[model samples]
Target: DLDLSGKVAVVTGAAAGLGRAEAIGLAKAGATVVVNDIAGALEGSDVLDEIAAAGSKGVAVAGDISQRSTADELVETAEGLGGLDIVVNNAGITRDRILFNMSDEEWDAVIAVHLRGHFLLTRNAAAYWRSKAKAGDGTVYGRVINTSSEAGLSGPVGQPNYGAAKAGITALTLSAARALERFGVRANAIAPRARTAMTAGVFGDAPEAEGQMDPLSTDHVVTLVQFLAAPASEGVNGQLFIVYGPSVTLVAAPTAEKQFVADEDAWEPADLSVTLRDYFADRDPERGFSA
Candidate 1:
């Protein structure tokens, strides 16, 4: 059973899209969910109502997640509801532009919301877990599930900023996994492909045939989040996965092509180039992105 009967979870950017789905799904799994989103629309309120209606506890947390104060508030909200067990960093913004045409504001905005937001929330939660562990709260049972993207895994044109930020999240997940393991916390990331307001018109690829399968549905994505946040996934850490349509794939981390030992004496530039080129000539490398 993947039940989270007494756990508390905080999901950011939860006013809509995958974030909202995650909040609701966690609640359905029996966790008290704290939905974090910037106040404005009725989305946050609607989510809270839905959680309660579904017979699980929930609260709404509205603020800019990039701020330290907001991060503290989110965790505090979780703590107020008994105890904090999981965090889903799903907040993100897009300011798409190609390299030459991209403005500083575009880059900064995307990076701040995605990368900085993840760090702030993760830092706050990890701190709490560390304190608990020191106070004899064995195996704090903390989980961090971060959201990344295929754009990050394979750099996409016209979205350099978004790709960079997502790539940074993957690194952040790995780093957090090692740093927080002592406190019994686990960290993992998912590069998800789903239909959302943010991505609706941009993917360009032909949509799947109607009634065949709904691969772009957000519901499919939330199941992965639910699994990762559950106690059953405690043994998984520092891993990256891809969620596409009806399939979930484990993404392999980048590794060295092969080790090449150089001579004791430094070789000439021309000679080194010749050796490298000759060795690589027979190897057909795949490009990370399409033009």
Candidate 2:
């Protein structure tokens, strides 16, 4: 129902998964879409074709997003096409290893792409927006969506690196939302669940789980994105949303829970253990457990 007829959008990792679904949806809403990927046959091939097949103006910009040079190049390409309006930073990778077992390289790789690459693209885009903003144009506006994870919100055993990067992404969103307000740009993030190669076997390759996870399946999750990319969502900024099938929730800073005791006495191990047990017992996982 949102109209973006004259708007332009750039989506990273658009070859498949949630990014692909988003590309198609935005295109349907009448935005020209640039589908970007690293040109891998298995994962990135579907993005460009899907965008075009949906009858939206789309182009493929295959580049290594983890590198600042590549990120700058992609932004330059968009600028040459005209002006940019929407940028979805959805490209990501998983280094699924526990903290003790995770290699330094594994941590570095994930961070380079998720955090560093996102910064690279965003910096370039904002530079352009600022220049245009000073020219007295119609706010040279843009929407930035970072791909976060439920695992980021709630720690997962084997994805310490991934969780750390995703957590930083939410911080990035909040920071950008404040920093870019003068230019009329907004930033938001989404932690999503759907059928994809990254988690294809999570539910045991079962029919029901698979059936429920249509990449195109959406609710307010999809609408939130479309809304953020529209001119109407000027008031919505700096938020993270968790979306899974029919359920939707907004993520906010939890209350500062540390209690200050008047009697500064050392607690016994039994007392500490009892309190710790209660705290963890109430904890919840972001997504449900799977195979």
Best lDDT among the predictions, by candidate number: 1
Question: TM-scores of the models, in the given order?
Answer: 0.91, 0.83
lDDT of 2 by residue, 1-291 (tens): 378787888888777766777888888788888877777742536655666776778877777788877777777777776778898888888878989899999999999888887888877778778887888675767889788888777767898888889888888888888888877898888888766666666733424363355432544356667877888888778888887666768876666445634334787777777776786678775423321
Q: Alpha carbon lDDT of residue 8, candidate 1?
A: 94
> Looking at candidate 2, what is the lDDT of residue 57?
82
In the range 38-134, model 1's lDDT, one tens digit per residue, is: 8884252578887887789988888999899999999998888988899999988888898899999999999999999999999999889988888
Q: What are the clash counts of all predictions, listed in order? A: 0, 1
Report the Cα RMSD per candidate.
2.7, 5.0
lDDT of 1 at 123: 91
Angstrom error of the Cα, residue 210, model 2: value is 16
